[PDB]
Amino acid sequence: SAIFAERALLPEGWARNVRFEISADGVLAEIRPDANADGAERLGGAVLPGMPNLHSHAFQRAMAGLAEVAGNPNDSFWTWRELMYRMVARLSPEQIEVIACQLYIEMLKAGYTAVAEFHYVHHDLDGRSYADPAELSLRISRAASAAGIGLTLLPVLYSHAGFGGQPASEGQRRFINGSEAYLELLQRLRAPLEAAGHSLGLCFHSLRAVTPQQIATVLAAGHDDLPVHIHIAEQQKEVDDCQAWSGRRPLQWLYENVAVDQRWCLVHATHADPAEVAAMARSGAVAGLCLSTEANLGDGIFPATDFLAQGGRLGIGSDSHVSLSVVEELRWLEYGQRLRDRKRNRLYRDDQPMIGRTLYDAALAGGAQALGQPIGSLAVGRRADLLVLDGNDPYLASAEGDALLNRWLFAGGDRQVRDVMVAGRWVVRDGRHAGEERSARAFVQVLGELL
Amino acid sequence: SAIFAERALLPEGWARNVRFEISADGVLAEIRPDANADGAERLGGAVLPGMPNLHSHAFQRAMAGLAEVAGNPNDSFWTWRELMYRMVARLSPEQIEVIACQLYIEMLKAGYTAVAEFHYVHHDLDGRSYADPAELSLRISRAASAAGIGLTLLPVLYSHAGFGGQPASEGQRRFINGSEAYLELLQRLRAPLEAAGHSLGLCFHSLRAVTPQQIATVLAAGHDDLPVHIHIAEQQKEVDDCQAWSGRRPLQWLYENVAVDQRWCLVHATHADPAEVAAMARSGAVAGLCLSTEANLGDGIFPATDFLAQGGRLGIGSDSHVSLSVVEELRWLEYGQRLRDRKRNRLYRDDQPMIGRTLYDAALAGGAQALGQPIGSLAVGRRADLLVLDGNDPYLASAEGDALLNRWLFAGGDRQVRDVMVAGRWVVRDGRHAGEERSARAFVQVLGELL
Numbered sequence: 001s002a003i004f005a006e007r008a009l010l011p012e013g014w015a016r017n018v019r020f021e022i023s024a025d026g027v028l029a030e031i032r033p034d035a036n037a038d039g040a041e042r043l044g045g046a047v048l049p050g051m052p053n054l055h056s057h058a059f060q061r062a063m064a065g066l067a068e069v070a071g072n073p074n075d076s077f078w079t080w081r082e083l084m085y086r087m088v089a090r091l092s093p094e095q096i097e098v099i100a101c102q103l104y105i106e107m108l109k110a111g112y113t114a115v116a117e118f119h120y121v122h123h124d125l126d127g128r129s130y131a132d133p134a135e136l137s138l139r140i141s142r143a144a145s146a147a148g149i150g151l152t153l154l155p156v157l158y159s160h161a162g163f164g165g166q167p168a169s170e171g172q173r174r175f176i177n178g179s180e181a182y183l184e185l186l187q188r189l190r191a192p193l194e195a196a197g198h199s200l201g202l203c204f205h206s207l208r209a210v211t212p213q214q215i216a217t218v219l220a221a222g223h224d225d226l227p228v229h230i231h232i233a234e235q236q237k238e239v240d241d242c243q244a245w246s247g248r249r250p251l252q253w254l255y256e257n258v259a260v261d262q263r264w265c266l267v268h269a270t271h272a273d274p275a276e277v278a279a280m281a282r283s284g285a286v287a288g289l290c291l292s293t294e295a296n297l298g299d300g301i302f303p304a305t306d307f308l309a310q311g312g313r314l315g316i317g318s319d320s321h322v323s324l325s326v327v328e329e330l331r332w333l334e335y336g337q338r339l340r341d342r343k344r345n346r347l348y349r350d351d352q353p354m355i356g357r358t359l360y361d362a363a364l365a366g367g368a369q370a371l372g373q374p375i376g377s378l379a380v381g382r383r384a385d386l387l388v389l390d391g392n393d394p395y396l397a398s399a400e401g402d403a404l405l406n407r408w409l410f411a412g413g414d415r416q417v418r419d420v421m422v423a424g425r426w427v428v429r430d431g432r433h434a435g436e437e438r439s440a441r442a443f444v445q446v447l448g449e450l451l
Numbered sequence: 452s453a454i455f456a457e458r459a460l461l462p463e464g465w466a467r468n469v470r471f472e473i474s475a476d477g478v479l480a481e482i483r484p485d486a487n488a489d490g491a492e493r494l495g496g497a498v499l500p501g502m503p504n505l506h507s508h509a510f511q512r513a514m515a516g517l518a519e520v521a522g523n524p525n526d527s528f529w530t531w532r533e534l535m536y537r538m539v540a541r542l543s544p545e546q547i548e549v550i551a552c553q554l555y556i557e558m559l560k561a562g563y564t565a566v567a568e569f570h571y572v573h574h575d576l577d578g579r580s581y582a583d584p585a586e587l588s589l590r591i592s593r594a595a596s597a598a599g600i601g602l603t604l605l606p607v608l609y610s611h612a613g614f615g616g617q618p619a620s621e622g623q624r625r626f627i628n629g630s631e632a633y634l635e636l637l638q639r640l641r642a643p644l645e646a647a648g649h650s651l652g653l654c655f656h657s658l659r660a661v662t663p664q665q666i667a668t669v670l671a672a673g674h675d676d677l678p679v680h681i682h683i684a685e686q687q688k689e690v691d692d693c694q695a696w697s698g699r700r701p702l703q704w705l706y707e708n709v710a711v712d713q714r715w716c717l718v719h720a721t722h723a724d725p726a727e728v729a730a731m732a733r734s735g736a737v738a739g740l741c742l743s744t745e746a747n748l749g750d751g752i753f754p755a756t757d758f759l760a761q762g763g764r765l766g767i768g769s770d771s772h773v774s775l776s777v778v779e780e781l782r783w784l785e786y787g788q789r790l791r792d793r794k795r796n797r798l799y800r801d802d803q804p805m806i807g808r809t810l811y812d813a814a815l816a817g818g819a820q821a822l823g824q825p826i827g828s829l830a831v832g833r834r835a836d837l838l839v840l841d842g843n844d845p846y847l848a849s850a851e852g853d854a855l856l857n858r859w860l861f862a863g864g865d866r867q868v869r870d871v872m873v874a875g876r877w878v879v880r881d882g883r884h885a886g887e888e889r890s891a892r893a894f895v896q897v898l899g900e901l902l
């Protein structure tokens with residue numbers, strides 16, 4: 001099939017009158033600027049590569065916004081976590097799948113074309129494994145296929161309640177596997193994920209939830225083709241606890257004990273000192289920044305300017321899913337730096353003074369890297385994942401090139417995303433997803449059951 | 452006319468099956484909970500009082516997002532201001548009116564039902580007064596009437612380029628009046644504003660732009676029925692410069708020299724020390740918080756928790772209009788406190804642990820007070836200004852009462868606002884404004900002329 005864009009963001013920059021040929025398998029086959037639109041579908045606005053969402057816990061969308069109730073003069077991430085545990089304890093396989101499908105539809109409508117699902121809900125309500133232990137992982141994949149979103153599934157190794165291999169809490173029972181069971185699950189998922197066109201990654205929940213021996217064992221297991229994700233340094237408390245345990249900060253510890261490299265996505269990485277930031281940038285690992293969730297949870301502000309200045313790589317994730325908005329994440333990534341520094345125009349490159357473009361370029365690349373998928377760029381051989389902005393919007397229609405990204409990301413919003421394509425298939429057209437009516441009905445029923 | 456809401460937020464709290472009778476002049480005449488809907492228009496979702504927008508400079512919407520270009524390693528509010536001056540210098544009366552009309556339509560669609568226009572663009576391109584000096588003020592009123600938004604017009608006294616009565620810059624020439632000309636303008640505006648059903652307020656641009664003698668003169672002029680607005684303590688530089696000039700901080704100076712009271716709206720007030728915060732709360736003045744603009748400009752984070760704890764009053768303004776979203780302002784008001792404190796659930800009351808409700812209650816009241824209009828509450832005798840959320844949205848449909856406000860403000864967004872009424876007139880229905888097509892066409896033409 002062929003599509004035609006009057007304006008599109010290609011790897012070398014903005015181009016005009018671009019005709020794209022897309023293979024039967026949804027791969028970009030030919031990309032020709034300054035072309036004729038003969039026989040191709042003329043698109044309704046500016047075309048961008050779709051944005052990967054590099055961090056998600058799908059079920060949390062069901063509780064999004066409901067934890068905004070003061071139960072203590074010093075509510076924190078840790079009292080929030082108790083509320084999250086209460087919801088996880090009651091979620092059936094069917095409810096989990098319904099929530100995931102609805103969430104992924106909403107992600108697509110916002111311009112997220114692929115998602116890394118950081119998946120730790122494994123076992124039944126009693127903490128016992130399903131007859132096929134992959135039960136819930138397979139439902140995540142089925143939900144992603146139903147929505148039409150790209151997926152890297154990251155089954156999560158989770159074994160302990162804290163540093164030093166503390167015994168898992170009853171509230172964590174659904175998450176728990178030893179290294180052996182985890183490696184078996186990981187290997188068993190390869191075939192069904194491959195069959196669905198989905199990807200896989202290795203994942204440790206956090207340094208609190210696994211031991212150094214487990215990390216070594218898993219990394220030595222031969223899955224060298226897979227991304228590696230971990231939550232790290234999100235809260236000051238984890239930093240303090242890590243130091244009490246090892247005499248090291250979390251990032252410091254990881255870099256001193258593990259060969260962190262480009263395969264890695266360090267989720268949050270919020271409390272990174274100058275030495276830690278330098279080490280991250282040198283390694284080529286991707287910082288998985290989840291700006292709306294980090295703000296919602298009161299984590300803090302990442303040293304993004306220092307990191308970017310040293311060649312750091314980053315992407316964005318919606319995480320707890322209080323926000324499902326490429327705009328909000330990139331906007332408030334920048335705005336957080338502005339509020340901290342009390343200055344404007346913080347995240348730019350030496351060769352790119354445009355803030356919107358700097359942010360979009362960065363998050364596309366980091367997102368594609370963290371997912372381990374051939375995405376993030378409209379180039380021949382990469383998957384046809386793209387969004388079409390509103391060509392009738394007066395702000396966008398009056399803007400060209402990088403100014404258009406500034407209008408969208410800093411003055412605009414989600415509803416300026418009109419059409420979305422994943423793997424060469426239209427999954428959102430004029431703001432609508434074909435599965436939205438059925439999904440919303442299933443989802444509101446599930447919300448009623450839970451609440 | 453009569454309307455009927457299955458759920459509505461009334462002054463005493465959430466109520467069910469509320470029938471509202473609205474006078475021919477758009478005033479709430481009867482409000483009856485647990486009623487029958489016989490002969491009344493059944494509304495499509497939860498009903499809230501409309502949100503006042505207590506601070507706007509309309510023309511800035513035309514440049515929204517375009518200033519996100521690094522031109523210096525330390526870009527700041529002050530280099531942004533130069534760019535703003537370049538745009539003001541080229542704006543014709545017709546362009547200003549087109550921008551205002553389009554902006555006000557967009558405000559209504561977001562749920563802002565009334566706006567305080569902090570209006571300082573007075574004179575012609577040469578800095579000379581129009582034949583009727585009220586030329587541009589009258590166009591703001593005409594634009595507000597065309598959109599259907601409530602309006603408090605705040606013509607701005609602006610006389611100087613800095614502390615100590617420094618001579619105005621050429622870039623400020625369109626703003627300049629002496630106290631006498633300003634008072635004449637203010638008095639001349641009363642009749643046309645009254646005729647349009649609009650309101651008026653006194654306004655000093657900032658302590659940089661006027662002298663203490665001017666403040667005294669204007670406040671002694673007998674306009675005791677009017678709100679009084681001023682930008683204050685927004686940037687650290689103003690604090691330092693104020694101290695060099697007077698030996699006092701900006702808020703400190705204002706409270707020591709002027710009888711600040713409930714008539715006042717202190718816009719930004721960002722750099723308020725503990726003594727200044729206490730003085731603000733004691734006075735009953737309204738803090739005019741413009742969260743998206745303050746973040747965009749790198750101003751800093753207001754001590755909202757300390758202020759609210761002492762009975763402080765606040766409202767929200769869209770200001771430079773990079774954002775037009777009740778959701779974004781209230782959400783990031785709270786999130787800024789969370790990022791600073793590294794804690795959750797910051798802005799609540801002793802009698803109200805629900806964060807969304809605390810924020811909505813606060814901003815409704817502060818907004819109504821700052822505008823000097825009978826709004827902010829669905830009570831008999833107040834104007835019928837309201838919004839209707841999406842009753843078909845699964846998050847909202849599954850929620851009741853204050854949980855619904857948490858779903859909207861912390862997990863939802865602008866498109867959940869479906870219908871908007873101002874002065875008893877429907878101005879947005881199913882997300883659409885009747886004037887949107889004509890306005891957008893005029894507006895895109897104006898953008899082309901400017902850019």
Ligand SMILES: N=C(N)N[C@@H](CCC(=O)O)C(=O)O
Nearest residue numbers: 057081206231234293297320
């Ligand atoms: N840290 C965030 N935002 N979320 C975690 C909470 C639980 C934990 O970290 O132990 C999670 O979903 O696993």
Ligand SMILES: N=C(N)N[C@@H](CCC(=O)O)C(=O)O
Nearest residue numbers: 508532657682685744748771
């Ligand atoms: N401070 C903000 N955000 N805006 C001001 C800029 C100019 C000034 O403060 O002198 C204004 O629009 O007048």
Ligand SMILES: [Zn+2]
Nearest residue numbers: 057118231319
């Ligand atoms: Zn997470």
Ligand SMILES: [Zn+2]
Nearest residue numbers: 508569682770
């Ligand atoms: Zn202002």
